[PDB]
């Protein structure tokens, strides 16, 4: 058994209140109140549609992914990553695809900076559509489960999916819903040998998930990067400040790009 698995049982054993307190203990949060109120009226200018943008900004503002040219965002939901890339200096084109429909988030049309570069469709199932050429691949797909084996099945589908989309020296940031299961480690190692990058933990992630993102401009041993984060999450069980710490949202400008 891996350390991640020990962690997952310990999580599932928690009571309802302890769960909600642990989930946000000492993590990082985004001040979203005004951005949401803005959107809940007609406002289309300045706001991120999701806390997803803040999440992507963390990776980029550090040069772990450098989106550019033709960007594909698989499972883009409301559009938080897409709209975010739409205003980055080098990015030429953003295409985003999702499920939508009853029970899922629909794309939300916005006029943030570079909105014209960005094209979103719902009703799409990414697993059965032909791969297209591109320069940067993004993917935030993975529906969590109480059962880590289910999670590994779901994650290995996402991995086989992105492989088919990956070229040569293309930029990427790909959610790995479950990185600790033995079968995922293996696929990740084979994938690292063939495309590079490594796994990195985002501090905006909640303690209730062990997700790590495969980003292109990083290195590090797969096994170590993973165990590091299991030990962290276990350390966080007995924590003694028990509060999230907030940071401002992203302003995404307004207007068309060229």
Known binding positions: 50, 80-81, 98-99, 125-126, 213
Position 230 contacts ligand SAH (CB under 6 A): no
Is 1 in contact with 145 (CB distance < 8 Å)? no
CA distance 8 to 147: 9
Residue 163 contact partner, candidates ligand GTA, ligand SAH, none, CB within 5 to 8 A by sort of partner: none
Closest CA to 67 of 136, 11, 141: 136
CA distance 1 to 247: 37
Closest to ligand SAH by CB, 22 vs 59, is 59
- Per-residue binding letters, 127-166, with ligand SAH (x by CB under 6 A): x------------xx-------------------------
Specify which residues 212 forms β-bridges with: 176
Position 237 contacts ligand GTA (CB under 6 A): no
Position 9 contacts ligand GTA (CB under 6 A): no
Cβ at position 127, least distance to ligand SAH in Å: 5
Judged by CB under 6 A, the residue of 1, 16, 169, 194 near ligand GTA is 16
- Point out the annotated binding site for S-adenosyl-L-methionine: 50, 80-81, 98-99, 125-126, 213
Closest CA to 141 of 151, 133, 132: 151
Handedness of CA 113, 101, 122, 60 (dihedral sign): positive
Position 75 contacts ligand SAH (CB under 6 A): yes
Position 125 contacts ligand SAH (CB under 6 A): yes
Specify which residues 163 forms β-bridges with: none
Closest to ligand GTA by CB, 16 vs 40, is 16
Position 146 contacts ligand GTA (CB under 6 A): yes
Give the contacts of 89 (CB within 8 A, at least 6 positions apart). Answer: none
Judged by CB under 6 A, the residue of 9, 12, 149, 160 near ligand GTA is 12
Stretches 40-48, 128-136, 139-147, 173-181: which one binds ligand GTA (CB under 6 A)?
Answer: 139-147
Residue 146 contact partner, candidates ligand GTA, ligand SAH, none, CB within 5 to 8 A by sort of partner: ligand GTA
Judged by CB under 6 A, the residue of 104, 231, 242, 243 near ligand SAH is 104
Number of H helices and number of E strands within the chain?
8, 9
Give CA separation, 50 vs 71, 110, 136, in Å. Answer: 19, 12, 21
Cβ at position 37, least distance to ligand SAH in Å: 18
- Per-residue binding letters, 148-187, with ligand GTA (x by CB under 6 A): ----------------------------------------
Within 10 A of 211 (CB to CB), how many other CB atoms are there? Answer: 21
CA distance 146 to 92: 40
Pull the structure tokens for residue 125. Answer: 């199932």
């Amino acid at each position: 058994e891996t350390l991640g698995e020990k962690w997952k049982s310990r999580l599932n054993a928690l009571g309802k209140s302890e769960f909600q307190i642990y989930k946000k203990s000492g993590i990082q949060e985004v001040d979203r109140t005004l951005a949401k109120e803005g959107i809940k009226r007609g406002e289309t200018d300045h706001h991120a549609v999701s806390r997803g943008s803040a999440k992507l900004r963390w990776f980029v503002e550090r040069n772990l992914v450098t989106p550019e040219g033709k960007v594909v965002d698989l499972g883009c939901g409301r559009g938080g990553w897409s709209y975010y890339c739409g205003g980055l200096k080098n990015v030429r084109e953003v295409k985003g695809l999702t499920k939508g429909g009853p029970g899922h988030e629909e794309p939300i049309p916005m006029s943030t900076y570079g909105w014209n570069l960005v094209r979103l469709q719902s009703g799409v199932d990414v697993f059965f559509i032909p791969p297209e050429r591109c320069d940067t691949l993004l993917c935030d797909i993975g529906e969590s489960s109480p059962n880590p084996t289910v999670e590994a099945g779901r994650t290995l589908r996402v991995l086989n999916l992105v492989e088919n989309w990956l070229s040569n020296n293309t930029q990427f940031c790909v959610k790995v819903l479950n990185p600790y299961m033995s079968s995922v480690i293996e696929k990740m190692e084979a994938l690292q040998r063939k495309h590079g990058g490594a796994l990195v933990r985002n501090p905006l992630s909640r303690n209730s998930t062990h997700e790590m993102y495969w980003v292109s401009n990083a290195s590090g041993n797969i096994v170590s990067s993973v165990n590091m984060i299991s030990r962290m999450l276990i350390n966080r069980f007995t924590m003694r400040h028990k509060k999230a710490t907030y940071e401002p949202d992203v302003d995404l400008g307004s207007g068309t790009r060229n």
